Every structure is written in C-alpha cells, then in structure tokens.
Amino acid sequence: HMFDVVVIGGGISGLSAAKLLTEYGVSVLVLEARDRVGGRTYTIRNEHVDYVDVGGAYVGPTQNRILRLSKELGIETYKVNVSERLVQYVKGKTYPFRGAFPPVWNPIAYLDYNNLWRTIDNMGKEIPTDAPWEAQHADKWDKMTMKELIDKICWTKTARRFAYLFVNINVTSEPHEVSALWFLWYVKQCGGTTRIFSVTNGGQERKFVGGSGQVSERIMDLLGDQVKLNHPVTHVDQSSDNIIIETLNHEHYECKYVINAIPPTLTAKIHFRPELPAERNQLIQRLPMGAVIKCMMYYKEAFWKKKDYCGCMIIEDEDAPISITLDDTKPDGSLPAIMGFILARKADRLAKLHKEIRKKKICELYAKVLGSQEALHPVHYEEKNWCEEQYSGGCYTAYFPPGIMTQYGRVIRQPVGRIFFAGTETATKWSGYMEGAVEAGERAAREVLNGLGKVTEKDIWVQEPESKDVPAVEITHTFWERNLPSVSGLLKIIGFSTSVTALGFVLYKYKLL
Numbered sequence: 001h002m003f004d005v006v007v008i009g010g011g012i013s014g015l016s017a018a019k020l021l022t023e024y025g026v027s028v029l030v031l032e033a034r035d036r037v038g039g040r041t042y043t044i045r046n047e048h049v050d051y052v053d054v055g056g057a058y059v060g061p062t063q064n065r066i067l068r069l070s071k072e073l074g075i076e077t078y079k080v081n082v083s084e085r086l087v088q089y090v091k092g093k094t095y096p097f098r099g100a101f102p103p104v105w106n107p108i109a110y111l112d113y114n115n116l117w118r119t120i121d122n123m124g125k126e127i128p129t130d131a132p133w134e135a136q137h138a139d140k141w142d143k144m145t146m147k148e149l150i151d152k153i154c155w156t157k158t159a160r161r162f163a164y165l166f167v168n169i170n171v172t173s174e175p176h177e178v179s180a181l182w183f184l185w186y187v188k189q190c191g192g193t194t195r196i197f198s199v200t201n202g203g204q205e206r207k208f209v210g211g212s213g214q215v216s217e218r219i220m221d222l223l224g225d226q227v228k229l230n231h232p233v234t235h236v237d238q239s240s241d242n243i244i245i246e247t248l249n250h251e252h253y254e255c256k257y258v259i260n261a262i263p264p265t266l267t268a269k270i271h272f273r274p275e276l277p278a279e280r281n282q283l284i285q286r287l288p289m290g291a292v293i294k295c296m297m298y299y300k301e302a303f304w305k306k307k308d309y310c311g312c313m314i315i316e317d318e319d320a321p322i323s324i325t326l327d328d329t330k331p332d333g334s335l336p337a338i339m340g341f342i343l344a345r346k347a348d349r350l351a352k353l354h355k356e357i358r359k360k361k362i363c364e365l366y367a368k369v370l371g372s373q374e375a376l377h378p379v380h381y382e383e384k385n386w387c388e389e390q391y392s393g394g395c396y397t398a399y400f401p402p403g404i405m406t407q408y409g410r411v412i413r414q415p416v417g418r419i420f421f422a423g424t425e426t427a428t429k430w431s432g433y434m435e436g437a438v439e440a441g442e443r444a445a446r447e448v449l450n451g452l453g454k455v456t457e458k459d460i461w462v463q464e465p466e467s468k469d470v471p472a473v474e475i476t477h478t479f480w481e482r483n484l485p486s487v488s489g490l491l492k493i494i495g496f497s498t499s500v501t502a503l504g505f506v507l508y509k510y511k512l513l
C-alpha cells in the first residue's frame with residue numbers, strides 16, 4: 001500500500017513508465033482498471049485465430065521506442081503483406097494499384113491531389129512538434145475544421161473526398177470535427193503524409209509476432225505483483241505530502257508521485273484534490289476519442305492473393321461498412337484474414353447493427369471489391385468496438401475540435417504539483433500510437449526521476465537511437481511532385497502565358513519579334 005510512485009493505467013504508456021522507474025530502484029504500483037493490461041492494445045487468443053490484435057497492431061520505421069521496448073521484451077516484428085496489388089474502391093469500381101496512394105489519372109485532379117499532400121506537409125512544417133499552439137498561424141488554423149481546409153485547398157471533388165477519407169483513416173473522426181491545426185500537427189508528428197499512410201517505409205509496415213498485447217503482458221511479468229488489475233482509480237489527493245489514491249473498490253494507496261497514464265476523457269473522471277487547474281479541466285473534457293470498430297474476417301485461403309491483391313482495400317464509398325483494410329494472415333501463411341476498420345460516423349452507424357448483420361455486410365463489400373464470391377465464406381469473424389470501451393473511450397486516439405488547441409492545449413502534458421501525465425495523447429512524436437505511449441511513459445517516468453533527484457533536467461527527454469532492424473529510409477518526393485502547380489497555380493501561369501502568347505502575336509503582326 002505505500003509506494004514512491006503510482007501509475008494510473010497499465011497501457012503501454014503506464015507500463016513503460018513503471019518499467020523505467022523499476023530500473024531505477026523506485027517502488028511503483030500500477031493500478032489498472034481492467035482485468036488485463038495493454039489498454040488500447042489487446043491481443044485476443046483463441047483457437048480460431050491463434051492470436052489477433054483487436055486494438056493497436058502496427059509499427060514501422062521511425063517508431064524507435066516501441067521497436068526497442070518490444071525487442072528488449074523478446075517480441076519480433078513481421079512485415080505487413082503488400083506483395084500484391086493494393087486496391088481503391090470508388091464509385092462502384094475497383095481500381096488495383098501499387099504504391100502508397102491510389103493513382104489519379106485525370107490531369108487536373110492530379111495537380112489537385114498532388115498539391116493537397118504537399119500542402120498538408122508544408123503547412124505542417126510550420127507547426128512546432130511539441131508546441132503546436134505556438135505555430136505562426138496557430139490561431140487562424142485552429143479556428144478551421146479540416147473539412148474547411150480541405151475544401152479550401154482542393155478544387156476537385158475526388159481530391160476532397162479522398163482527403164476526408166485520409167482524415168477518417170488517420171484520426172478516426174470526421175474532417176468537420178477536427179481542428180486543421182491539430183490535424184496538420186498530427187500528420188507532421190508522424191513523419192508526414194507519406195510516412196503516416198504507407199505500409200512500406202511507413203507506419204503500417206509491420207506487426208508483432210504473437211501480438212502487440214505482449215508488449216504489456218511481459219512488462220507486467222517483470223513487475224510481478226507491482227501491477228494491480230481491476231483497480232480503476234477514482235480519486236487522487238495530493239493535499240498532503242503523501243498523495244492518497246483511491247480506487248473504485250475503496251482501496252487506498254499512498255505515494256509521493258503519480259503518473260496519470262490514461263487518455264484525457266478518462267482523466268476527466270478522476271476526482272482530483274486539489275482540483276486541477278481550470279484550463280486543464282477544460283482541456284481534458286474537451287478531447288473526444290475517435291470511433292473505430294476493428295473487424296477481422298478469417299478465410300481458408302487468401303483468395304485475394306490469387307487475384308493478385310494484397311488485401312489492402314482503400315474503400316471510398318459512403319454506404320460501405322469498412323473504410324480501409326489489410327491482410328492479416330499469419331506470418332507463416334496460415335489463418336488468412338482481412339483486417340478492416342469501420343471509422344468515424346460509419347462506426348457509430350454500424351455499431352447499432354447486430355454483429356451478424358455487420359459481418360454479413362462486410363463480406364458482401366469484400367466480395368464486391370475483390371470481385372470474388374469466396375469473400376462470402378468466412379470461416380470466422382472477430383470484432384472489437386472501441387466506441388464502447390469504457391476504460392478507453394474510443395480509438396485510436398483523442399482528437400482536438402477547432403479552438404481547443406489554442407484555447408487550452410498548452411497544458412496537455414504539464415504536471416499538476418506531483419502528478420505527471422503520460423499516455424500517448426501527451427507524446428510529441430507518434431502521439432496517438434503505441435510508439436507515443438512509450439515516449440510518453442518513459443518521459444513521465446523521467447519527470448518523476450528528476451523530482452526524486454535521480455535524473456537531470458537535460459535527461460527527461462531522451463532521443464531514441466534508430467532501430468537497426470527497422471531503419472528509417474528517408475521519404476523523398478519526385479521533381480514533379482515538388483514543382484507541379486496546384487490547380488490555382490496552373491491558372492496563374494496559364495494567364496501569364498495566354499497573356500504572353502498574345503503579346504507574341506502582337507509582336508509578330510507588328511513584325512517586331
């Protein structure tokens with residue numbers, strides 16, 4: 001019952017924190033609300049699936065903390081399948097393709113699309129990773145929704161529609177719901193558009209053998225009985241020098257420091273004393289979670305592979321259940337599966353259906369999309385609705401509605417007295433991700449170790465050596481990607497050379513050429 005540190009939450013962020021503190025000889029108790037660890041990562045194990053991640057799954061280049069943390073725990077990664085053709089499903093029609101983004105054949109649409117990604121990334125360049133509210137344009141951009149920005153950026157309908165999907169896919173919410181400032185920041189802090197969206201050399205490159213649930217399971221092993229499951233913290237009281245923590249079953253723990261390692265929306269329910277600053281209380285009640293239902297469809301045979309598809313479908317169609325999928329076949333070829341997400345508005349919609357109506361609907365879309373009736377004969381179906389996770393609030397992460405970032409956002413990871421705040425939402429790189437959970441756990445641990453006098457100020461924020469197993473190849477854009485004009489830019493240029501072609505006709509008739 002008496003510890004130096006209590007960590008509230010045994011997600012990756014909380015366990016990381018607890019694991020670091022333990023290395024330093026500090027006593028830590030982790031108080032985990034659920035009957036398991038790992039939080040928004042959850043590897044289910046039954047004999048239908050062997051194992052499957054129903055929560056966070058993927059890792060890739062530049063995600064150095066999670067790779068290092070997982071490697072040290074004896075967890076191996078494997079590459080996501082992209083040997084075959086990706087597909088785009090738009091307007092009833094399936095378009096196979098290669099590369100990260102679907103091809104845009106229409107020349108004007110192409111300039112639009114191209115300019116959209118470059119502009120997302122250039123606008124990002126201005127946003128400080130760790131102080132987005134300090135952006136030169138923070139106030140202006142934070143007032144916009146991402147729908148407004150997209151519609152301001154994009155002339156074509158294709159580009160707009162796609163960009164709205166891009167939003168859904170990344171922040172599992174609707175572009176009208178999210179600040180353009182926060183969204184530009186969110187893609188920036190994941191490496192940019194190409195890194196965030198890609199499989200190869202991107203955030204979706206890899207998965208863990210045996211599941212990402214294992215990152216948390218094994219740290220809980222190392223911590224032994226220093227991790228208590230079924231202890232949701234309901235009160236935290238730092239009035240006196242021993243902080244008193246109370247759990248839902250009325251147990252009391254005391255400690256010198258607390259690391260809050262749960263998302264904002266759950267932070268918002270803890271009864272703190274003294275009360276948190278009023279900015280902070282506003283902040284943490286105004287960050288909603290996104291909406292995802294992760295659905296895994298199992299088949300006997302990876303029939304998509306026969307048709308030369310990898311199982312990655314980018315599904316751009318309002319009435320389709322799923323938005324995006326990946327092959328989820330086991331690394332040795334066994335238990336073939338498609339992983340699909342139901343995202344944003346569509347998740348809230350679909351969640352009101354029965355499971356077997358959701359199943360049926362997904363199989364039908366897949367038959368349609370992959371053009372094969374074999375899609376209608378799944379051998380098993382696994383799903384997790386994160387909207388209905390009481391100790392998660394939703395997935396993958398919190399979004400910032402317009403206004404919130406410049407109004408209350410500065411204090412997102414500021415300590416309140418001896419309470420330090422971890423959780424992926426407070427990470428500055430790959431925040432929203434398992435990677436950002438580790439950055440944030442280890443940095444809060446270090447904030448506590450600085451307090452205990454065991455680590456210096458300089459040492460709180462430590463950069464991760466690059467993984468040698470999964471190194472980061474640099475994202476490059478072609479000459480044409482860099483320099484093609486936006487639609488609007490075309491018009492400017494064309495006006496300049498219709499004009500001048502005219503003057504070369506004035507000069508030619510005058511004969512002064």
Ligand SMILES: Cc1cc2nc3c(=O)[nH]c(=O)nc-3n(C[C@H](O)[C@H](O)[C@H](O)COP(=O)(O)OP(=O)(O)OC[C@H]3O[C@@H](n4cnc5c(N)ncnc54)[C@H](O)[C@@H]3O)c2cc1C
Pocket residue numbers: 008009010011012013014031032033034036037038039040041054055056057058059231232233234261262263266292293294386391392394395396397422423424425432433434435436437
């Ligand atoms: C469907 C899904 C897909 C995603 N895909 C990916 C992916 O492919 N790659 C990736 O990197 N990330 C992905 N993410 C996000 C990733 O899962 C999270 O960013 C990461 O797990 C968050 O870690 P955390 O430690 O910060 O928070 P959490 O994992 O939420 O940990 C919080 C912990 O606190 C507990 N808790 C809540 N309230 C209390 C309380 N009051 N007291 C005590 N404990 C409490 C919870 O039970 C939980 O165990 C996804 C998440 C989901 C749900």
Ligand SMILES: COc1ccc2c(c1)[nH]c1c(C)nccc12
Pocket residue numbers: 058100169170196197198199204312314324325326
């Ligand atoms: C471009 O194709 C995909 C496939 C899966 C994901 C994706 C893009 N972006 C994702 C994110 C941000 N999280 C989980 C899965 C995916």
Ligand SMILES: CCCCCCCCCCP(C)(C)=O
Pocket residue numbers: 103104105106107108110111
């Ligand atoms: C002046 C018109 C602009 C020219 C650009 C058109 C590019 C289309 C072909 C590239 P893709 C392989 C389909 O992405």
Ligand SMILES: CCCCCCCCCCP(C)(C)=O
Pocket residue numbers: 478479480481
């Ligand atoms: C003068 C206008 C015509 C320009 C030709 C268009 C070339 C597009 C190729 C696209 P990428 C090779 C992927 O960057």
